[PDB]
What we know:
The complex is a heterotrimer, with two copies of chain A and one copy of chain C. Chain A is mainly beta. Helix content of chain A is 8%, strand content 47%. In chain A, a hairpin with a 2-residue loop joins strand 3 and strand 4 (50-52). The N and C termini of chain A lie far apart (65 Å). Chain C has two domains: 1-79, Immunoglobulins (Immunoglobulin-like, Sandwich); 80-164, Immunoglobulins (Immunoglobulin-like, Sandwich). In chain C, the strands form four sheets. In chain C, strands 10, 12, 13, 15, 16 and 17 form a six-stranded mixed β-sheet that branches. Chain C starts with a strand and ends with a strand. The complex binds a molecule of 8 linked components (NAG-NAG-BMA-MAN-NAG-GAL-MAN-NAG) and a molecule of 3 linked components (NAG-NAG-BMA) (2 copies). Chain C: Keywords: Cell membrane, Disulfide bond, Glycoprotein, GPI-anchor, IgG-binding protein, Immunoglobulin domain, Lipoprotein, Membrane, Receptor, Repeat, Secreted, Signal.
Amino acid sequence: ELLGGPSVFLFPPKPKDTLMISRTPEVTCVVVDVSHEDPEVKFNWYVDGVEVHNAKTKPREEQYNSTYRVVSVLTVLHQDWLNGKEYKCKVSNKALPAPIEKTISKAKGQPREPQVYTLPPSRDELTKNQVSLTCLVKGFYPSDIAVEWESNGQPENNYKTTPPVLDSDGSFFLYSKLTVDKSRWQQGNVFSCSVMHEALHNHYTQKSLSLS
Amino acid sequence: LGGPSVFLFPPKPKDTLMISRTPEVTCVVVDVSHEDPEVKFNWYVDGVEVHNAKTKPREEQYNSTYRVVSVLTVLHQDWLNGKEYKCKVSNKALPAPIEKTISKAKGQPREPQVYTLPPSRDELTKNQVSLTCLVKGFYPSDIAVEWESNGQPENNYKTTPPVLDSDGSFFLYSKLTVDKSRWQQGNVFSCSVMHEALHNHYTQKSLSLS
Amino acid sequence: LPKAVVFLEPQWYSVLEKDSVTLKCQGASTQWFHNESLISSQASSYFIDAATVQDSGEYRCQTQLSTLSDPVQLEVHIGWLLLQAPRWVFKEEDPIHLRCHSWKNTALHKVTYLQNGKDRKYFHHNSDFHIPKATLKDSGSYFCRGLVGSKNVSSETVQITITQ
Ligand SMILES: *[C@@H]1O[C@H](CO)[C@@H](O[C@@H]2O[C@H](CO)[C@@H](O[C@@H]3O[C@H](CO[C@H]4O[C@H](CO)[C@@H](O)[C@H](O)[C@@H]4O[C@@H]4O[C@H](CO)[C@@H](O[C@@H]5O[C@H](CO)[C@H](O)[C@H](O)[C@H]5O)[C@H](O)[C@H]4NC(C)=O)[C@@H](O)[C@H](O[C@H]4O[C@H](CO)[C@@H](O)[C@H](O)[C@@H]4O[C@@H]4O[C@H](CO)[C@@H](O)[C@H](O)[C@H]4NC(C)=O)[C@@H]3O)[C@H](O)[C@H]2NC(C)=O)[C@H](O)[C@H]1NC(C)=O
Ligand SMILES: *[C@@H]1O[C@H](CO)[C@@H](O[C@@H]2O[C@H](CO)[C@@H](O[C@@H]3O[C@H](CO)[C@@H](O)[C@H](O)[C@@H]3O)[C@H](O)[C@H]2NC(C)=O)[C@H](O)[C@H]1NC(C)=O
Ligand SMILES: *[C@@H]1O[C@H](CO)[C@@H](O[C@@H]2O[C@H](CO)[C@@H](O[C@@H]3O[C@H](CO)[C@@H](O)[C@H](O)[C@@H]3O)[C@H](O)[C@H]2NC(C)=O)[C@H](O)[C@H]1NC(C)=O
């Protein structure tokens, strides 16, 4: 019983996908709550008001709640996304009085360059068998950012990054924690925190951290 | 389907962790019409009705509906021992009463470890610097973190939400911002953590120039 | 010679697509004019089963014992909701009748009628908004809003004038 008919949700690219030319950023338009009685969905796509035809729509899938869900994916140009072009998904269906339009674009506001600081473990944590390497990334805007770690130039895996947190001056900050065996820290392997953000020169910085 | 709506809110972690404070469960009812504005609250603790809740007078909201609040004081130890609190709301516009239940997050508690981190060498070239308090390995995620120096609270700090770590416990960071002067003079700053799995529900770590 | 009259059942001059509307003529077979073109139909009343936006515009009736009727302007809108009133200009003390009409009469709940951005009246289930006597305080921009199942929908704003 879907009184309101179908709903639409429109998702932006991943930050890393827009910051690296080797990757392909995508805008994702998801129509959910499609009834079995009128399952035909039409997708129109617009960039700054101009229709495009290079979208890729996959056919429907029945859900657990016995409705259909349908996804259309449009790849975007990095420079287009980053220059603030608007992406519009228009979804047509009979169960609606009019077609639903949704629009997304990169977050507005003046870019601010993130400052990256690496912080070694506390003395008090050197008594355990794993230790925490910390990367503080502050003073950035907008909050779209990606953070990775490496050890001696090879990617590390066991790390977690807090969400961006709005700071008192309107920029964001976050922390990233890499957990390493104390052996690897005391042996002197060089760890590095890598930050990708639009306001960085070449969209990329890296800070290093070593015993120490 | 229409009718009023009920939201039931837990105490603040700090209020359940300190004996001098008073924790409270809060039952809020919204979308109460002028036409049927009388709301009855029944309160149950582990299924036994209690009678010490304080119901407030209704208040008209910006959208011309009424909202009415009923507040139940809870004993610290009852909340931390996992008792269930149930608010039951009766109104003429409901077909049958709405019931909501709330209690402390379940799961094995783990003791948070607290580590202060001084500012990066590279940040010392700025007018203001970041003092970091890392709190990790704790469960459940309810926690309070505060800063102070010389016994007085420090205002200019922000704390991340808890993050689920790859071992099932939580961590967060708290960042205090201070003028570089205050750091280089030698003042001691200190990070206070409140969590049910600490001894005295409390611990404290200091941070000073070496 | 008497000019025929055009009456609408129901009384709303603004409807949504897929509303029904009967336009009756009051004169004396009759002849109907939509956008000044004879249509079709030639029964006493002209009936629209499911309005579309093309059905909008000017209508006129006429019968053998009457002149060409003064025109009536019918408006068809697209949306989930439409604020309807028998008219939009009111003297003081006149009664105000507002209807929050939903597309295909879809069940609508948690309805509010809003004047100048501030919700003025709330109902659990869709109902008409009645102001028995109009004050100068009642002028302004009005619309209605509610939940269609779980979807939060809203109507366009209509201007209400109280003269005076
Ligand atoms: C039947 O069952 C259906 C499921 O099978 C169910 O469908 C769900 O319906 C929900 C609504 O009822 C809907 O909820 C919305 O979800 C939004 C977030 O969804 C993402 O995250 C979820 C977990 O948090 C995931 O489960 C979702 O799948 C989705 O996950 C994202 O997916 C995208 C694309 O797949 C992906 O991006 C792409 O990734 C690829 C790689 O995979 C590439 O990287 C691409 O480049 C990239 O584009 C994301 O990475 C992925 N994210 C994650 C985290 O995994 C959520 O945003 C919605 O909230 C808004 O609206 C509600 C109102 O409904 C508000 O309450 C809420 O506050 C938000 O409101 C908005 O806030 C905005 C602030 O920014 C503001 O702008 C707006 O003003 C404000 N209002 C509006 C209207 O926007 C919302 O919760 C859920 O996603 C559906 N699930 C699925 C699987 O589709 C259906 O409901 C069931 N039917 C019935 C009748 O019950
Ligand atoms: C009788 O006259 C009225 C008024 O001239 C006509 O109403 C108009 O109908 C057209 C056609 O549907 C509407 O234009 C459409 O607008 C949408 C929205 O931008 C656009 O996407 C379409 O391509 C189309 O241009 C127009 O809005 C509407 N005007 C008014 C004031 O309602 C009516 O259609 C005429 N009917 C006949 C049978 O001739
Ligand atoms: C359906 O969606 C609308 C649009 O978002 C929701 O309306 C919004 O309701 C909030 C809460 O009443 C309004 O905020 C209020 O603002 C005033 C001052 O501006 C303040 O005094 C209140 O405390 C509150 O913060 C908000 O303005 C309003 N949005 C608009 C555009 O007017 C509505 O609640 C939704 N309804 C349902 C049933 O989901």
